[PDB]
Design a protein around this ligand. Sequence first.
Ligand SMILES: [Mg+2]
Ligand SMILES: [Mg+2]
Ligand SMILES: [Mg+2]
Ligand SMILES: [Mg+2]
Lengths: 1021, 1021
Amino acid sequence: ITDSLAVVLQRRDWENPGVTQLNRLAAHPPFASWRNSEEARTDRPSQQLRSLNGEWRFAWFPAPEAVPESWLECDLPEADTVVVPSNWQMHGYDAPIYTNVTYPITVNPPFVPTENPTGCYSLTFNVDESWLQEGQTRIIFDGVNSAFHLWCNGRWVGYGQDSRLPSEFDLSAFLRAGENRLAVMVLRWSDGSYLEDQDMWRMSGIFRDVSLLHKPTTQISDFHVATRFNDDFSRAVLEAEVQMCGELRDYLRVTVSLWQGETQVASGTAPFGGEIIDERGGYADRVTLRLNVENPKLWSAEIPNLYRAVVELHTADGTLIEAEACDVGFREVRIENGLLLLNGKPLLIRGVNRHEHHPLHGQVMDEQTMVQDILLMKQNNFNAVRCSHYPNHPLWYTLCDRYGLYVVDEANIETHGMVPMNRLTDDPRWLPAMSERVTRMVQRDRNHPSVIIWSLGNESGHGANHDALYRWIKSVDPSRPVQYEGGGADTTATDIICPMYARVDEDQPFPAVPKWSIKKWLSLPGETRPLILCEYAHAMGNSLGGFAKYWQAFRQYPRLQGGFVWDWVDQSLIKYDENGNPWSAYGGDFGDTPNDRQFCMNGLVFADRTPHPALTEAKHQQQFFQFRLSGQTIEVTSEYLFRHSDNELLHWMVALDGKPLASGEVPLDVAPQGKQLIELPELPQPESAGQLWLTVRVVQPNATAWSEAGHISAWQQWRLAENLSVTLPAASHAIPHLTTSEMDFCIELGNKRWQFNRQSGFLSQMWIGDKKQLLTPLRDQFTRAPLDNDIGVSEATRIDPNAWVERWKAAGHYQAEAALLQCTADTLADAVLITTAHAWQHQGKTLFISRKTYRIDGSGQMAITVDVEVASDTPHPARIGLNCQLAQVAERVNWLGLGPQENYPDRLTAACFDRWDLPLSDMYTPYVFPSENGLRCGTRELNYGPHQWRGDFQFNISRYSQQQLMETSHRHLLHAEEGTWLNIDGFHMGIGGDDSWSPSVSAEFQLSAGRYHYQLVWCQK
Amino acid sequence: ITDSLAVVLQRRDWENPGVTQLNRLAAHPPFASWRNSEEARTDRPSQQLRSLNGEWRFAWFPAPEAVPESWLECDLPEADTVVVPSNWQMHGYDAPIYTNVTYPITVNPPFVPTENPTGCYSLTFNVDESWLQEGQTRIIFDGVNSAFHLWCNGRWVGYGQDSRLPSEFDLSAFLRAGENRLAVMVLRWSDGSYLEDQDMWRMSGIFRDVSLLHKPTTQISDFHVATRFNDDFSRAVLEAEVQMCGELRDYLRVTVSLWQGETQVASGTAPFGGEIIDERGGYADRVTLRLNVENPKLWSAEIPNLYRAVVELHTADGTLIEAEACDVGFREVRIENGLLLLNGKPLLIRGVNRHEHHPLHGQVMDEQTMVQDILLMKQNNFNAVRCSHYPNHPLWYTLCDRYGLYVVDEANIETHGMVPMNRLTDDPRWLPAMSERVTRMVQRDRNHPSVIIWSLGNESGHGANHDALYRWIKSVDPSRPVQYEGGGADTTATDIICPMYARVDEDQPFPAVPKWSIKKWLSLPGETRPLILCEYAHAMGNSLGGFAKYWQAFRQYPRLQGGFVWDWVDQSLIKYDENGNPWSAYGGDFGDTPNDRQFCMNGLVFADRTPHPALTEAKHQQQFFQFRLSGQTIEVTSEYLFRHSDNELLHWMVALDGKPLASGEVPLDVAPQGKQLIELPELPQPESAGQLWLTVRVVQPNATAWSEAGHISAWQQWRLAENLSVTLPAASHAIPHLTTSEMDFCIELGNKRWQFNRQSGFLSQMWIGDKKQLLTPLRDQFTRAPLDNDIGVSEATRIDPNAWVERWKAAGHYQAEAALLQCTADTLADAVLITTAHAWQHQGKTLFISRKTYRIDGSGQMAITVDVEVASDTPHPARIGLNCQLAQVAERVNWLGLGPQENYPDRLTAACFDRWDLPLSDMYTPYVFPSENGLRCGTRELNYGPHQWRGDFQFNISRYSQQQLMETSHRHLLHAEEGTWLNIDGFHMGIGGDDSWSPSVSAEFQLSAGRYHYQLVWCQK
Ligand SMILES: [Mg+2]
Ligand SMILES: [Mg+2]
Ligand SMILES: [Mg+2]
Ligand SMILES: [Mg+2]
């Protein structure tokens, strides 16, 4: 009767920040109630802990109150069978909504909508009779988004908010023997939604595991591990505080054993009862053991040395009551004197921001995905990661612990969408709620060594509630620093200045919360804290430009400890068409409103873990070994702090314009932070003409837990010498014919035949025999299908006039109109001289002027010269080059230049000067929101079909027009064009990336010189 | 239905620290919602604010579950009409409990005993049709101890915890035009009880007020005032922050005017919408005004300069909506460099701790008791009060604002009875709960100028949760320092070392929570904070010894900025007898179990606000002027910080053994912290034997808010000179006759005859005429009727062998037997000489030995000479004197010694050397729990009836023997005895009082010499 939906829903606890839980067990580190030390030690699975993940009965409802009381007694009939864990939007119940800042619902704290997409989960399961004999039987929800009610065997059990932490109830007195039934009322929105406004898809459901744990009545109830070190780390104390629950008796004991493998390192035995604490006594129900550990093995991302701590609750005459355990990592995290030191040396954080996202599964994490992400990171020079923006699924910590990644464990608190941002964070009434998102996260995760930094949530501004909460952390877990970015990045509630998107060299003095140049920030009078970017470099689309700029400051300034890239994966979601063929969908593609489109895809890797090009930029910049060449002594520096170049070989190779002349290999013997002198054998020199390049690569001869053998860890390249070509070509054995008309000019030599259109002024066509080549005349181009950075936060509704695209559009770049000023064929000794001048204008403003001379010769080779003028008062061109569409459609592509991967000017460090040969396909980059791509800079020679082009250019080549890319919202809607489109640029503007909602391109990357000159040479084979 | 008791009651929210409120409005400074600015200005009462104080109907129940649904519907036939506010225990429903540490209920968080006295209150009242058209009507409960549920017109409204803070609910939608009825059910025990374990009687009910408030829909929802200053305090800035409720309309303005009396001083008008705060902007619904005030009148306890702030919420046409107001105090409170400064100068807290306690009303306060208390305090040289141990009735802040007291505001949080104390305060599950007990106090008291410091509660140990709360305050209100004594008095949760019971020069090195002497604490390594006692000079019964030692240090050590004495009033209650007489009762007398007896009475004034003699000692020690005499120049130092002696006459005077030879009367013109030179007129000098004494008093000719005319604020005496008596009493015209016999000797001289028992050694009897004089032979006395301090925490069931009494007991002192060692009468030339000797012994050990000589001359005068020997191993005796019971009973007492009030060795500074005459009755101290008392030190002459004792002794004289005192539990059970018991002490040991639960008499006051010599001269005139 008082279990009735009736009576229950009455209260509307989901509409009360002052009710966060109902009948909820205290938080705590992960338990398994083993009853065999050995297993516990070996982390063998627990017979006392049962998963209820799987098939389950679910049924969706528009709102709470539409639920029928029957449901508490018997399963509904239209109740579909579903899988748990899962997100119901992932099942087609409702739409997944992609909103950033803007709240999904209407802002009326603490009120939520009546139309409250409720989902009912149900489950029938049998309990051993043994479970009900003794012990307690509790249940666990690793995450239920957003809030829910719960019932067992028709009776009400409890309530709980906070989608990111576990909720546990004591089922002990409600289950009967054999057949039992669960009734879970997950509400979609609650007063707790006002605290989960993170930038990600908004979904629901029981998205993490569900389990059953049976503990004995007299049990272990919480435990903490602590490690103190002497001055040289040669010795540590392992301190354990153990708390029990149950009636205390003089026979109870507690042993805590430390294991290194099979070998028992230290063991301690003691009976309950703590030291005096106050005028009343101590905890009788606690005990602290201190284990003395000598010349311990330290944990780092560099070497994840773990131990196993087993905690046993037993009697004096040896009977074992139960065991628990955790991995132990001996590390000291300390901010000393402006520096964030780990085990004494000052860290350099090469990390990134990551969400729990699966294109397919929504926000359900699995062991495989986890593992995958990590190895990729690890493989790409990542050290650390941030749980942006909530505590993650439990296994995560264990993988980082085991594999070696520093984690910044972050509280599930984000109220971005409030005005001001502080509205709640600064409201005493929201104290309790936040409080619990902080306290429980700490109490659950505090034993993992990977966690080295606790965060207070994200963009919630700065409120008196953060100060209190941070004070709490400091008080309870002095082992780690706390940090929080809200309110200006330097508030009193952070131990680190941790801004997002601060620029290296340029300031953004916004009212109340500016963004000083990072280097500048450190010296602001007063200031002495380390600076570590909590978010920097927007991996959004074609991005990561300027990346190096960052890597370089980090390296020159001590107090700049690196930072976290935004972000790892594309929060894109899979959809299917009129033929069950899938495609990658983004915000509002689910009819979701309001939404924020592509804004959800800022990763370094596709949502399927296939990497984006930027990823290599990161990998090279983040590399652990640095080099400098001096004569033929290569000096190698270790950027490792703890480890030794003990699985690395140096590959060196000397080449002349793609031709290898020499190679050798050296094993690295650099200590962490150390140097290593390498002298190379008298290097070869050719009489032959062309650039000599030196390329070194670092290799991992042996596999690791996260890398393959022969994995390349780092690299670097130097141009050695240039041997200028002073050989004037053989003055062609014949001369070219010219034939004229009023329409065009035609040049003929062999089967070769060109033709210029006297009207228009461009090479309109060319034949190699009865075959034609162009489908499109060859004309100048000064635009580009805009990148995400170019567009930014501009929308047809609302226009961002400062955004590049807006600027170009406005200036008429996109709709210019050529004009033939001149076009002249002249005849020379052994050549033909075509000569043009065109003027680009929009509304009687000459935007540009392109002056040119084609000079065909008896070898059947034309030499294009271009000389453009750009008006000082026009937004600087995205680019400056030529383009055209050929007919050939060849399988490969081969050039002598940077690559093999897509490189743009402000992002080209990870690339190498070589002779690359790829499939055309690899020439297009499958960004989900089409835009200019696949460019390759620094090309000296291109080759496709029978044509070859030569000189100093940037180029790109696909079967998509710059214009097709630009009028297509999804990569899935692109269609190949008739032949190959070619873009040959003498010049290309930067890509930007510092952020995607304002102009990121740095001056040196902008094309603002007014005069450009470039040459080409086209020819065939 | 859902309103039903059953449904409601079902969730047992008073058994869950999670739910602490249900639908309660937020907190804020006192509002009245005046609809005329003048009334606001002048504080005239509000038509919009209605009191429900009065006659209610009430029914007591042994349990919440015993309540009958009906209740919600209709009142009860057997419901008693009762008054409100009140304490039901004050009525008879149940028994008040007087317990200290030990909780009233059984320790089992968050659980409460099933049997939980419950009180249903209900009330039928009328609502003005007008209140129901517009605005919001709400209800205020100023104090419901300890939890409650509310119903309106049979509907359920909400729930509240926290006994010492208002709970307000909007009744808006439950009020029916005309007759409404209230249904309140208060619970005696709730989980909130765990945080209210303060040492005091434990009662319950609706002990403060209940009002109705009518505010508009667009109203003022909170406002804080703040005041900055400049270096010299010549210009201040009053900054006011206004927040609102309702819908924001552009035509809304706010104006804050500052009045000083009649005269307007500053004004500000503006409209809503604050400065940019973060990425999202500012508060639209807030506004901040800054008014400049040149040379503000400053606020202090010396001079309460107060202004009036009116906050008007109006439209732009100048149409008023609502107005709010508060009194403003221009003062700056800072801890600069070790010192706690007020307005720039450093304080010296002359404080006391006070409880809201009325012998009759139980814990309901009234304005008249508040006033009294202040006035008495002020009169007695108190400066400050600490709200032990919860927020007080609102009026209390206002009287302090206006009269001049410094208040320490303290949270209603004390979990003393836990083990250890930290237990809940270090538990996050308890964070919200406490969070609210702090945050709400601040939201409410923050605007009073009297509050200079915030305290997180009392004796709750030190837990993470204090740290956070402490930081919370600092953040929210940096204008005040925070303090907490828990955990060692020096934790990170305090800005001040605020220990309790810390000894002046002696340390008490408890484990974990040592109590260093105060001089020494300061000087510990790293220590730099100021030191102020939260409790000291425990004033239980015959106490206050050593008080001066404390004063001396305060005054010598800068960082020792005084303390708060414990405590103000006696928590004794009034019981009635058979014949209808009242009598002070205490712990245990209401059949309370368990109870801490006399432990509830530690005050300076009886519960009837009649001073305890200790009062005077304090008043003198804390006096604002200090004296130094040199030659005949008095140098007055002023300890006032802010004010000049503008109401002070120094009256002076000189006498020889109570015979006033002289007196002047100068006018004090000393500035704060200045000196005044007082050269005295050539003072006489008589040839006569006697001591010449200089007394000086400082008088207040002008009556003040809290003082009459002719009130005395300071005093001091000095003996100036002694002319030695080198004269012998004339030739005895006669000689006494001795008549011998087996049992006795007799002396006769005229009508006077004396007899000494030859078998006992005592003067058995004496006659004047045919008038017997003694009722009890004059014998020797070593012990005393135990002071509370002598007893401590030694109970019958459990003995503390260190308690002084326990020691005297064990040693035999109380029951040793005399032993006639020798007794001889001899005949001198003109006198008779008696000579005795006795030994006192127990278990055959001589504790003491007294050799005497009585000697009678022709003058009719017996000079008694005494010489006592105390055994080294024996506990030093209490006293060393004689006693007997005379036959006469007189009306007055005259003596020339220290008076006029009870004074004791370690408590006599306040007393004065002079001739006093009082009525016997004034010579007994009505300590509720009877003990040695009324002593009078430094006597040189005492007269009772015909007798006259002469010499240098200490004495006391009542109609009660020490035995009575001893065996009598309450003063009311004391009966007068046949005659007059007299006690004449050559010596007395000090009273102690540093604390009442361990030895407190300083060595200097213990009779530890061995040999003691003294001599009387008994005679008649
Ligand atoms: Mg809630
Ligand atoms: Mg956001
Ligand atoms: Mg409660
Ligand atoms: Mg206490």
